[PDB]
Amino acid sequence: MKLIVAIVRPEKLNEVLKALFQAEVRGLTLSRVQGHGELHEKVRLEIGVSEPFVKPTVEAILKAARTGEVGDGKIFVLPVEKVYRIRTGEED
Amino acid sequence: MKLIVAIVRPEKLNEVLKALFQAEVRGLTLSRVQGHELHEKVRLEIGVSEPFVKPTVEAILKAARTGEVGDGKIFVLPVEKVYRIRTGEEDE
Amino acid sequence: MKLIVAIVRPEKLNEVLKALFQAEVRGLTLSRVQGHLHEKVRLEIGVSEPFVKPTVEAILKAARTGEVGDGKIFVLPVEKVYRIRTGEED
């Protein structure tokens, strides 16, 4: 699995959540953060996604979050050594 | 070294922290995030040495479980290096 | 690229931000978190390889007070970073 961390504009959050839902991504968390390069409000989404589907998930976010202006944000794809589901204790 | 990111139910937070402290886990940070029709969750971020990875994961898994959908997940992330600001000590 | 996650004292934040800016490290996000509880500020900064040490040093120098609880700096391997404005990788 990989961990996707995306920093997007607040005004694009609904488009992004919609695109993720249509791309079949359901499990995620998000929070408000302040960003720079004078700080601007941003929304940080964190999504665990298995390798075959990292590319499609990143694409949905890129398409939905873009405005074309400086300050659109970034998407980080981090490696994950192990992931566990707390409901069952199982390593996913 | 690893960076453990755990998403747990707020009502399980106290039990989780108690279990971590008993497992000799010490410094960590936490914040509230919205996750999935979203629900509030507590996101813990814990830096640990290799010998503490298993004990930390085990503690959260036993303490945060309710068996119902939405219990959360635990991500164990690789860390290239970590620095303690006070002492300037670096661990890899 | 690497992703740097730093936990610093709120009273040292402006000093940390100034030091980063001076080091040419401008793109980042931050948020308030609770530590150990005591409020802390968490910075998340994606940087190219040559900027890892300059970023770590800027924070180490500006955030230290000498008292226990000054924070930590994590350097994480990042596999890919995309610039949303262009839809391109970096």
Side-chain angles (χ1 to χ4, degrees):
Chain A
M1 188 170 289
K2 304 300 179 186
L3 187 69
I4 295 173
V5 177
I7 302 305
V8 309
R9 297 186 186 271
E11 55 265 44
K12 284 295 187 177
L13 184 64
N14 292 171
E15 286 182 48
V16 167
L17 291 175
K18 178 183 177 186
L20 287 167
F21 177 77
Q22 289 177 165
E24 303 305 324
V25 174
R26 303 278 182 283
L28 65 87
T29 57
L30 51 69
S31 57
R32 301 124 115 182
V33 301
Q34 291 302 99
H36 177 58
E38 59 153 68
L39 302 172
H40 305 98
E41 302 266 14
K42 285 289 204 280
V43 178
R44 177 186 184 282
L45 297 94
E46 193 172 71
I47 316 170
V49 177
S50 192
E51 184 111 82
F53 302 114
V54 172
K55 226 312 168 191
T57 304
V58 169
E59 290 175 350
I61 300 170
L62 290 175
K63 297 178 185 176
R66 188 184 185 187
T67 70
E69 308 185 34
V70 169
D72 273 357
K74 300 181 190 174
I75 297 178
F76 303 112
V77 178
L78 299 160
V80 174
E81 184 189 56
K82 293 174 296 175
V83 45
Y84 304 79
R85 172 94 51 187
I86 299 181
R87 186 184 187 185
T88 66
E90 174 165 43
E91 169 175 44
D92 291 312
Chain B
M1 313 304 291
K2 293 292 180 294
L3 179 60
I4 294 170
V5 180
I7 300 297
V8 308
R9 294 175 187 285
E11 59 265 33
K12 284 288 191 178
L13 181 57
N14 286 159
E15 305 168 38
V16 174
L17 295 177
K18 280 183 173 61
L20 287 172
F21 300 179
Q22 194 178 303
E24 299 186 67
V25 181
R26 289 294 175 270
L28 61 75
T29 59
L30 67 87
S31 58
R32 312 289 157 153
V33 298
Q34 301 308 310
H36 182 59
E37 310 182 307
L38 300 170
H39 301 285
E40 181 157 278
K41 305 295 186 182
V42 176
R43 173 174 185 286
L44 298 98
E45 199 158 51
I46 312 164
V48 295
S49 53
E50 296 301 307
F52 278 83
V53 174
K54 285 194 175 183
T56 298
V57 167
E58 177 81 346
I60 300 172
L61 286 183
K62 177 183 174 184
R65 181 187 176 296
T66 72
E68 302 306 316
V69 177
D71 275 358
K73 308 176 76 65
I74 301 174
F75 301 97
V76 182
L77 314 174
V79 167
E80 183 185 78
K81 59 184 67 176
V82 54
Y83 302 80
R84 184 171 287 285
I85 299 176
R86 180 175 60 82
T87 63
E89 305 168 310
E90 188 224 322
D91 293 291
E92 321 190 314
Chain C
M1 307 282 292
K2 295 292 174 281
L3 185 60
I4 291 176
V5 177
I7 305 300
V8 306
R9 296 178 186 278
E11 62 272 24
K12 307 246 67 177
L13 183 60
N14 296 312
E15 184 172 338
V16 168
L17 292 178
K18 292 176 183 177
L20 287 166
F21 185 102
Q22 299 284 300
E24 297 178 58
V25 173
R26 250 86 64 160
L28 58 78
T29 58
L30 59 84
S31 63
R32 271 64 191 184
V33 303
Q34 296 174 188
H36 209 301
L37 66 167
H38 305 289
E39 64 169 2
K40 303 291 188 189
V41 179
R42 174 185 184 283
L43 296 93
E44 198 161 31
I45 315 174
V47 302
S48 56
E49 305 301 327
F51 278 83
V52 178
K53 290 65 53 218
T55 297
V56 169
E57 297 181 10
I59 299 168
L60 286 180
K61 290 153 49 182
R64 183 181 190 274
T65 68
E67 248 53 68
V68 173
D70 279 345
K72 289 172 168 180
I73 300 170
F74 297 93
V75 177
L76 277 20
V78 179
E79 304 203 321
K80 293 177 179 60
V81 182
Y82 298 80
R83 198 157 209 69
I84 296 178
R85 185 189 89 229
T86 62
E88 288 166 23
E89 217 201 79
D90 287 47

